[PDB]
């Protein structure tokens, strides 16, 4: 057991070292953002805009499911007018950021890894190094900043759409009074601190997810089979990291 366990331990430590080195070498730089706008805009399109339909269509459904499962519980205690509070808080605290991060790792967290692994397979990174163009500054950092900028926005869209789906189920379908719903929801729970905590954990999830994605796409074996073993590894490790960091951040920000 110990014959291979220590080798695996030193291998995992070396993997963490390579990841940290990639991040540090790709982030340090003063001329970073300017002259890179035509890169960052394209990356915001690839990472952000293309990953918007899934976010919206999933937010609608999660809002509807929350509305149903909250109505069927609150109608027992005559508190069905607090369904707005329930939906909004369950989205702004746990479901919103975590589910947005999972779907981002699925759609845009695996696309980045696949794209960078394929760019490494056709030897575009080596060809970019051969003409004195540092790839870590030319191909990594635009994607990293696109992911970091684009996940906390998809999270806001996911929330503001799930709230509307819960409104569809509660107010329209079930028949709750809209005034009670909205007024009950806004004064009681939507404080500045809940939105700030949502955005904070969303930004942390963005950082970790896009870092894992870029690293697994940059450290993959160039063969067409090592890429697919890196996309699945990206999805798995990113889901695990999202859930663990979510538990930690909940324990921090909610007592």
């Amino acid at each position: 057991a110990l014959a291979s366990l220590g080798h695996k331990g030193i291998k995992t430590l070396r993997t963490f070292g390579r990841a940290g080195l990639m991040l540090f070498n790709a982030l340090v730089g003063k001329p970073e953002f300017r002259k890179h706008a035509p890169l960052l805009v394209r990356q915001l399109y690839n990472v952000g805009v293309l990953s918007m339909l899934i976010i919206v269509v999933s937010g609608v459904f999660i809002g509807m499911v929350l509305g149903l499962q909250g109505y069927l519980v609150l109608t027992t205690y005559s508190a069905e007018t607090s369904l707005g509070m329930l939906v909004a808080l369950s989205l702004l605290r746990e479901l919103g950021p975590v589910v947005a991060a999972l779907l981002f790792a699925g759609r845009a967290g695996s696309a980045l890894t696949a794209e960078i692994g394929l760019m490494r397979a056709t030897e575009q990174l080596s060809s970019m190094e051969m003409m004195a163009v540092d790839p870590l500054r030319r191909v990594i950092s635009p994607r990293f900043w696109a992911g970091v900028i684009s996940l906390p926005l998809l999270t806001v869209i996911f929330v503001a759409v799930g709230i509307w789906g819960g409104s569809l189920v509660g107010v329209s379908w079930k028949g709750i009074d809209s005034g009670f719903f909205w007024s009950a929801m806004q004064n009681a729970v939507d404080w500045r601190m809940d939105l700030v905590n949502c955005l904070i954990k969303s930004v942390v999830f963005a950082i970790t997810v896009t870092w894992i994605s870029l690293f697994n796409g940059y450290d993959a074996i160039p063969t067409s089979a090592g890429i697919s073993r890196a996309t699945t590894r990206t999805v798995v490790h990113s889901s695990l990291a999202v859930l663990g960091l979510d538990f930690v951040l909940t324990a921090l920000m909610f007592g």
Binding site: P38, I157, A160
Partner: peptide, 28 residues
Amino acid sequence: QTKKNEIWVGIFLLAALLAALFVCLKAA
């Protein structure tokens, strides 16, 4: 194939802003 990206990123930022305003106006 680049003004497409520009206008779509603009639409995405505008949608994110509208969502943030919806939330912050149903917040207080």
